[PDB]
Design a protein around this nucleic acid. Structure first.
Ligand SMILES: [Mg+2]
Ligand SMILES: [Mg+2]
Ligand SMILES: [Mg+2]
Ligand SMILES: [Zn+2]
Ligand SMILES: [Zn+2]
Lengths: 79, 182, 136, 49, 48
RNA sequence: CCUCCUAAAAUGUAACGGAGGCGCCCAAAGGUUCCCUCAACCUGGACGGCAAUCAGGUGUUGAGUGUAAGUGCACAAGGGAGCUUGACUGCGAGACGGACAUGUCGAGCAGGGACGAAAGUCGGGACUAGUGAUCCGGCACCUCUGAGUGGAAGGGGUGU
RNA sequence: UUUCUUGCCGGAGGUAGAGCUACUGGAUGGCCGAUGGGCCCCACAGGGUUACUGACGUCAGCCAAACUCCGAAUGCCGGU
């Protein structure tokens, strides 16, 4: 009359943080993820634990390249 | 200025013989010999590894090149085999070395087979490749008769540019192999 | 008495009884069939009983198909037990049946006994059902 | 313990600069490794203490 | 051909019991191998 | 503490709901440069057989990734070889996540190095578990203090 | 007025639904027939046989919270 189940880990709050069109500073975390479900594009780096972060100011833009989902930063212009 | 006898016997007339026999579209079509591969599948080295030393020494003395040790790519207890132990030695013969080696085979070792009744023509691949195994290593004059601790045979594979069985068999017959007829 | 050889998960959520059937809505192997007009879990004992009834009324000839396989398990807790302390143990096998689903299939020479056997089977099922035929 | 904590000291100034772990059964000997030693200001050989 | 890891190779000469001689290469350091039965001396190659 | 489902296509979400794993390991299974592509099947081969080693062909991912599950990886993060210790010191714009205390990523600068022709990469491991606040005490080092003064005892700082 | 509501624009999903020779499993009826059982020859080599068990493949009809070649409506983030 007991279950061998009942234990679980904490939620890691992964997911996309800055969606397409948002303006980000350099170094902002754009998406937290386990694998490379999204691959880095232009001006976007890849962390040790596979989070993509902006390398330069601009506007986030998603896209594809040879069947790969990518995240890019578009260089917004001067005011 | 140096040219092995089998290479010469190929180049002078096997070209024209095969060309007139098969009416090829052009010269590059004509089948030729690429490489010959000699290996000892020891296998029984799993119990004791020192068999590999005799195997590699015999291959070295019969081919003029030292072999490389082939390790196990899978683990199998039914044979009592684990990942990566010395299981076989291979020798790859190309060029004039292959040419004079298989001349030596076709002229010296094979006649020294005990009760040589021939080599089966049906031993081909279906893609122009000939392979035949051997049960003993004493045929080559380059092994002393008192050097044998135990018998250790070989597999000899001949790789040719022949498209399939017909031209493969034709080239090997023209080369002088002792085939049967049935 | 139909039971799957194995299942990946022995304990499962209940099958949902929503909507109407989208596959297996037409008679395909035999001449006449039984079509469901309700939603209901149908156990393997009910299928066994209906199959036996059709066979008995049909006697020698004819062939019977069962397009419904009970692969969904249901669990029940031991009796006289309070709530909690884990999930029950699997002791029914059912197949989810939506209206429009064709359950059984018959191929027999004569229409009268074909329909009579099909009705005999229908009276053993927990659903409202009707007999359908290949022609539109 | 099998994998204990070892401390590596610079061979020149004998300062305990780094602490790490190694398998003692696999590596019964002291660990020779070149590491940056701050006060020496350059990469000097280090030995397990 | 690597430097010195291979067994040495010497041009050799083979003469048979039929009196026919060759020119070839082998590991035989003596530079010549004497054989009893050769290609033209075997019954199979002679057709017997 | 970690992984999946429940969880209702952002995040989060309960129950004595459904399944598993962890309290390690590796001195290379880390860094770098360069090269390679599996599993499976067909055919032919001395022992050798379904399956050891060899050869040819078909084979785009079904093999494998130290270890659970998921997300990834064939452009390889999978296989191999050479050199090597960045499994660094002083830092760190900007962020994620959050009751708080914890936790996580990070471009870039300097020193002093590894590899590489160079560009460049390197602050452990494809990623997420492999752990324990504070107090109290031990050891090493420091251009701190030293109960009248010179020392010393004790106390501080840094690493552990 | 930065909050909120409506219109438009930019986004990333994987639920509902559906689909499966698109994966992992489950699973119905045929066709073909490996393998094995036993029978049949009897040698034990050398060959034809069988209520069968029936692989692999193939034709049709299906199922799944921990299946996905697909995939909404809403909701969420940002701009206007
Ligand atoms: Mg060929
Ligand atoms: Mg009824
Ligand atoms: Mg447990
Ligand atoms: Zn020092
Ligand atoms: Zn002779």
């Amino acid at each position: 009359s007991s279950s061998r189940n009942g234990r679980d880990s904490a939620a890691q709050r992964l997911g996309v943080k800055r969606f397409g069109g948002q303006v980000v500073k350099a170094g902002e975390i754009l998406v937290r993820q386990r694998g490379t479900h999204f691959h880095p594009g232009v001006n976007v780096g890849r962390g040790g634990d596979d989070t993509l972060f902006a390398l330069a100011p601009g506007a986030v833009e998603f896209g594809a390249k040879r069947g790969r989902k990518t995240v890019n930063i578009v260089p917004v212009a001067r005011p | 200025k140096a040219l092995p006898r089998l290479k010469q016997r190929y180049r002078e007339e096997i070209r024209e013989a095969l060309q007139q026999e098969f009416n090829y579209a052009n010269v590059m079509q004509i089948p030729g010999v690429v490489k010959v591969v000699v290996n000892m599948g020891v296998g029984d080295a799993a119990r004791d590894a020192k068999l590999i030393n005799g195997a590699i020494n015999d291959l070295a003395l019969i081919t003029g090149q030292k072999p490389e040790v082939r390790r196990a790519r899978k683990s199998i207890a039914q044979f009592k085999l684990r990942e990566g132990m010395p299981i076989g030695a291979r020798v790859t013969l190309r060029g004039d070395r292959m040419w004079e080696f298989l001349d030596r085979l076709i002229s010296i070792a094979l006649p020294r087979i005990r009760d040589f009744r021939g080599l089966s023509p049906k031993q081909f691949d279906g893609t122009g490749n000939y392979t035949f195994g051997l049960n003993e290593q004493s045929m080559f004059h380059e092994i002393d008769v008192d050097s044998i601790d135990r018998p250790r045979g070989m597999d000899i594979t001949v790789v040719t540019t022949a498209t399939n069985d017909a031209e493969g068999r034709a080239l090997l017959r023209a080369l002088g192999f002792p085939f049967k007829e049935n | 008495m139909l039971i799957p050889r194995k299942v990946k998960h022995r304990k499962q959520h209940h099958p949902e009884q929503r909507g109407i059937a989208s596959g297996g809505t037409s008679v395909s192997f035999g001449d006449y069939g039984i079509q469901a007009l309700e939603h209901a879990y149908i156990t393997n004992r009910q299928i066994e009983s209906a199959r036996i009834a059709i066979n008995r009324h049909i006697k020698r000839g004819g062939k019977v198909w069962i397009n419904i396989f009970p692969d969904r398990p249901l669990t029940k807790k031991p009796a006289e037990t309070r709530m909690g302390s884990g999930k029950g143990s699997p002791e029914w096998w059912v197949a989810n049946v939506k209206p429009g689903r064709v359950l059984f299939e018959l191929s027999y020479p004569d229409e009268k006994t074909a329909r009579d056997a099909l009705t005999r089977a229908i009276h053993k099922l927990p659903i409202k059902a009707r007999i359908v035929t290949r022609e539109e | 313990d099998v994998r204990p904590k070892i401390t590596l000291a610079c061979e020149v100034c004998k300062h305990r600069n780094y602490i790490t772990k190694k398998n003692r059964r696999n590596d019964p000997d002291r660990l020779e490794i070149k590491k940056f030693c701050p006060n020496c200001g350059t990469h000097q050989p280090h030995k397990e203490s | 051909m690597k430097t010195g890891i291979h067994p040495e190779y010497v041009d050799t000469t083979v003469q048979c019991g039929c009196g026919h001689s060759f020119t070839t290469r082998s590991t035989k350091q003596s530079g010549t191998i004497v054989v009893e039965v050769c290609s033209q001396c075997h019954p199979f190659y002679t057709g017997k």
